[PDB]
Write a structure and sequence with these properties.
Layout (H helix, E strand, L loop, with lengths): L4 E2 L8 E4 L2 E11 L7 E8 L5 E7 L3 E4 L3 E10 L4 E5 L4 E4 L19 E6 L2 E6 L3 E9 L10 E6 L4 E5 L7 E5 L4 E5 L1
Antiparallel strand pairs: 1-6, 2-3, 2-6, 3-4, 4-5, 7-8, 7-10, 8-9, 10-11, 12-13, 12-15, 13-14, 15-16
Pfam family, one: EFP
Protein name: Elongation factor P
Pathway: Protein biosynthesis; polypeptide chain elongation
Length: 187
């Protein structure tokens, strides 16, 4: 699917075919001692088995980059045990709990957030929410009386609990950074 390129052209998050398996690059570091041939040290993770390894390539070593399938999907419903997502042409995908890290804490019935699903030949590699999402507060206590100059706990509709601003009220909408799972603003 993609033409070969040299080891020095790969960066983190790209994927290389090594022995016929897809390995994602977790880290790459280029080195050249004066006028000796340059090399590249890579930390790699095999997308099919989970195995990690670190190795050094010649900078001009040829490797086939792998092109993962990326699709926008929305969450549809929970069959049990699998989670059903759907793309814009109405194709369904059944996804295991184990492949929904990050996403799972904010999954809710009727979720409208467009997720990005990443595939290698009909194996799911990752599902990720938008970097910012909006959620309604299901339950929170009124602000405490007394300060000295912060956060209080809130429940979302799906049962998740989060620290939010002390001025937050039941029914308010909050922006959430999905990278960290943390509150950022009321909206």
């Amino acid at each position: 699917m993609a033409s070969m390129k040299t080891a020095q052209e790969f960066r983190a998050g790209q994927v290389a075919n090594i022995n016929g398996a897809p390995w994602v690059i977790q880290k790459a570091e280029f080195n050249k001692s004066g006028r000796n041939a340059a090399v590249v040290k890579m930390k790699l993770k095999n997308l099919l088995t989970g195995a990690g390894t670190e190795t050094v390539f010649k900078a001009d070593d040829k490797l086939e980059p792998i092109i993962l399938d990326r699709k926008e999907v929305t969450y549809s419903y929970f069959a049990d045990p699998l989670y059903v997502f759907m793309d814009s042409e109405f194709n369904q995908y059944e996804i295991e709990k184990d492949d929904l890290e990050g996403v799972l804490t904010f999954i809710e019935d009727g979720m409208t957030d467009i997720c990005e699903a990443v595939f290698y030949n009909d194996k799911v590699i990752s599902v990720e929410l938008p970097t910012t999402i909006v959620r309604q507060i299901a339950y929170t206590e009124p602000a405490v009386r007394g300060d000295t100059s912060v956060m209080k706990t809130a429940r979302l509709n799906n049962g998740a609990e989060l620290q939010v601003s002390a001025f937050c009220e039941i029914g308010d909408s909050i922006e959430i950074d999905t990278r960290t799972g943390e509150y950022k603003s009321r909206v």
